[PDB]
From a paper:
Gene transfer agents (GTAs) are DNA-containing phage-like particles produced by some species of bacteria and archaea. The genes encoding proteins that form [name] [name] particles (RcGTA) are derived from phage DNA, which has been integrated into the bacterial genome. Here, we use cryo-electron microscopy (cryo-EM) to determine the structures of RcGTA before and after DNA ejection, and to visualize the interactions of RcGTA with [name] cells. Particles of RcGTA have heads with a diameter of 38-nm and 49-nm long tails.
The structure of the native RcGTA head with imposed fivefold symmetry has been determined to a resolution of 3.6 Å. Unlike the phage heads that are isometric or prolate, the capsid of RcGTA is oblate with the shortened dimension along the tail axis. The organization of the RcGTA capsid is derived from a T = 3 quasi-icosahedral lattice; however, it lacks five hexamers of major capsid proteins in its central part, which results in a shortening of the head. The volume for packaging DNA in the oblate head is 35% smaller than that of the corresponding T = 3 icosahedral head. The formation of the oblate head of RcGTA requires conformational adjustments of quasi-hexamers of major capsid proteins positioned on the twofold axes of the oblate head relative to the quasi-hexamers positioned on the threefold axes of the T = 3 quasi-icosahedral capsid. By contrast, the quasi-hexamers on twofold axes of the oblate capsid are bent to enable seamless closure of the oblate head. The quasi-hexamers on twofold axes of the oblate head contain subunits in three conformations: two subunits binding to pentamers from different directions, and one binding to a hexamer of capsid proteins. The surface of the RcGTA head is decorated with eleven 70-Å long head spikes attached to pentamers of major capsid proteins. Each head spike is composed of a pentamer of base proteins Rcc01079, and a single subunit of head fiber protein Rcc01080. Base proteins attach to the capsid by the N-termini, each of which binds to axial domains of two adjacent major capsid proteins within a pentamer.
Numbering used by the authors:
A (entry chain P4): 89 to 97
B (entry chain S4): 98 to 298, 305 to 385
C (entry chain B3), H (entry chain C3), I (entry chain D3), J (entry chain E3), K (entry chain A3): 1 to 84
D (entry chain F3): 2 to 11
E (entry chain T4): 98 to 145
F (entry chain W4): 146 to 193
G (entry chain W4): 243 to 298, 305 to 385
L (entry chain T4): 194 to 242
Write the structure that this text describes.
């Protein structure tokens, strides 16, 4: 549950 | 044509399913809306007279009373999630983080219920000033020793399990359980007779007694307490709040959401006579 | 590193623990052995738990699979080492 | 009697 | 501000739990309002 | 955390997420049956 | 296991129990062995120093259910003949649960030529929930 | 103090109880032994429970894992002690 | 009076029943023995149930834990007694 | 007629099947034996399944309870017969 | 091709694996053996896991069913090979 | 106290039901002049050794 820019997060 | 194929995702975002055997299901859980919990046990018993017809009757004994103070610490986690994710990530991320935070807390309190110390976490039964059984006073947990330093005993192995069972008290064995970890349960199931057949016969019980596979007890070291056994439902008191307090903060991390979630839980042993341990010293 | 560490030690199993015995004579042994490896040949006297004793004209290096309670010193000319 | 290694009687 | 903390006590005072296997649950328990009780047994049998 | 009383709790970890793609291939067979068999073979050969 | 072809000779059936207890606590609550029939026969033939087979209708092993597949390798030099784990969490099958039939009276002309297909897929979803037994060393 | 006290005593197990035997000759032994430790070499005759008997040309200190019912005195030149 | 009366007699157990054997030569034994106590040293020939035979250069009083079906008389110079 | 026909044949049990061995030297044995009865005394070399080999200075009629995979012919002066 | 492949290897079972031992003297053995086959007769010293040690006046080809942790080199004149 | 006195009474009568003697308490079955079984009469309990 982080940013939608990084794929793995 | 291959840009029309729109892969279907899962219904619920899955995860690796770690251990939930947390000693909470076998111990005494008490709801508490305070900062500390105080169990009151008796460490002695009364006296009976067998009074005669017409002789006398004196004063008899009265059980002296011990207060044990559950400190009721807290346990906090704060993941930082993005506001663009929470609006556009169709899985319900609020309740998914609320489930995963609850799972992480139920797993991290299992280590504190067994081998945690006093500082901001519950004290497990292992850190409770062990004294060899036979010279058993009240403010201590009893153990029996196996024999050889590393492994079990040499000539007679697995009676360390038996005298540990039959040194636990007759009323406590009515609903008792072993507590081990997995690489001790593997070593106990590897024990075998002089022919090559393992001598012991879904809860994976031992000698009829249930077995709780923890993951937070020590393994079989030189002087470790790898196997415990007893009535944890009378021996260990968990005091807690039966909810998971979630507060979302869109304000400090400004484009983020920052779920601050914290349940609070405490506990030590309430009845010292109801848990025995297996030491591998001598 | 023993591969037989988990195996139980029966009476039929080999000697795990050995200790030399003295002909104690009316003081019983510390631990009664599963077998006796004889060091020097001769005669030695052995008592059961039931109390009856005989003399054994034993040879030099023989193992004898007897389980004695006490080795007396009256007729004992032979030195042995216990196995357990 | 038989083929073991066992310090035993038979 | 640590005197306002008032620790919650137990609901029921607990105790050390001693053995209750007492032979009463396997023997013949008889209510009696007297000074004594007289069990009348037959120490022999008849013949046919 | 096991957060202290006055500790000023900073951030914690948050699980990284992996997607595994099931490819969903297909599995096909084509038996060749006789029209003389299907008309004259009173068992229901289509559902068989 | 130990030795290359067979199990470990001196202590045997331990390669089974450390495979069980190297899988995790939660996944063993509902796990299963997966073998084929000539592996399960070779397991049941294992016996102690008395000649008595030591493993005491789904044909479970050590309490855990056993799926006798037929497509695993047999006990070879470096084969993985016994698998164990919670495949309900570990392995995911994604499919269409209908069997599409199209009869073709048109290409093969005196024949009917039923073209049937279903589409299915799937690999491991949870890597923590499947443990294997290699026979190498 | 035996660490093997709880262990059962099988036929394969070592000798717990020993008693010297006499060549009784048509009176059976008190207890039939698991094995016979020979004291003096020679010949001795042994009878089964089925009744058939043979002569054994035995040596001096041998143990022989036979379980005899009666030791007769006709051809017995060898003294032995029973193990049980 | 045997204290081991209830115990089962295994192959590893001591000799309950003994009978002297003759070198029968192409007539099989009555009962095949668990072991052979040799009386007089020499050579003796032994056949399995699978049929293969070898000569054993045996000594005088040895027990040999072999389970033979038939003892032939071609190369047999040694007298033995069977144990069962 | 064996009374022990229903009994299972363990490693500890007596020798059911015997076959003479040749010092084969880099061709493994047909069946690996439970034990080796030596016929003529001398030296013989034995290889495990793990591959390590030692020389055994063996005597004449000894049984040695070893379970060898291959008997090599380099240092083998002693003839033996396998037991299984 | 072993017919006893499925059988478990107990302490009482024959020697599957053999390795020659060196008198290491305050470095323990790699694997502790079930038994010791002696190669050359003499004296050798053996230590248990409990630490007590005795000297064994051993003969030439004897097997001794002892399970030692360490063979020291002080009084060891005898070469042996371990069995496991 | 009404629960704990009852607990101690149920635990203290078990000693009298088993090894108690005749004086002011029930006489347990261990104190009943045991005579070896085989020579068994009515007024005595039997034991085997």
């Amino acid at each position: 549950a982080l940013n939608s820019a990084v794929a793995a997060e | 044509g291959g840009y029309l194929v729109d892969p279907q995702t899962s219904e619920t975002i899955r995860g690796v399913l770690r251990s939930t055997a947390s000693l909470r299901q076998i111990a005494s859980v008490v709801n508490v809306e305070a900062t500390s919990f105080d169990v009151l046990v008796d460490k002695t018993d009364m006296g009976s007279g067998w009074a005669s017809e017409t002789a006398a009757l004196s004063e008899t004994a009265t059980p002296q009373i011990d207060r044990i103070t559950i400190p009721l610490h807290e346990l906090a986690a704060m993941p930082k999630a993005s506001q663009r994710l929470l609006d556009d990530s169709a899985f319900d991320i609020e309740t998914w983080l609320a489930n995963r935070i609850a799972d992480k807390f139920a797993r991290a309190e299992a280590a504190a219920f067994i081998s945690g110390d006093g500082v901001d976490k519950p004290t497990g039964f292992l850190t409770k000033t062990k004294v060899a059984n036979g010279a058993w006073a009240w403010g201590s947990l009893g153990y029996v020793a196996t024999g050889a330093a590393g492994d079990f005993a040499a000539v007679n192995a697995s009676d360390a399990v038996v005298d540990l069972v039959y040194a636990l008290g007759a009323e406590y064995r009515a609903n008792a359980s072993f507590v081990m970890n997995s690489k001790t349960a593997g070593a106990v199931r590897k024990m075998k007779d002089a022919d090559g057949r393992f001598l012991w016969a879904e809860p994976a019980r031992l000698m009829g007694y249930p077995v709780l596979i923890a993951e937070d007890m020590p393994d079989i070291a030189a002087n470790a307490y790898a196997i415990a056994f007893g009535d944890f439902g009378n021996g260990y008191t968990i005091a807690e709040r039966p909810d998971l307090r979630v507060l979302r903060d869109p304000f400090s991390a400004k484009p983020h959401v920052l779920f601050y979630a914290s349940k609070r839980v405490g506990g030590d042993v309430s009845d010292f006579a109801a848990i025995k341990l297996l030491k591998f010293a001598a | 590193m023993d591969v037989f560490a988990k195996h139980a030690v029966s009476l039929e199993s080999p000697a795990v623990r050995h200790y030399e015995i003295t002909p104690s004579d009316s003081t019983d042994l510390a631990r009664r052995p599963r077998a006796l490896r004889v060091q020097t040949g001769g005669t030695l006297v052995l008592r059961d738990e039931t109390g009856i004793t005989v003399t054994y004209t034993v040879f030099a290096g023989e193992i004898l699979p007897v389980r004695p309670v006490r080795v007396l010193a009256t007729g004992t000319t032979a030195t042995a080492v216990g196995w357990e | 009697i038989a083929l073991g290694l066992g310090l035993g009687l038979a």
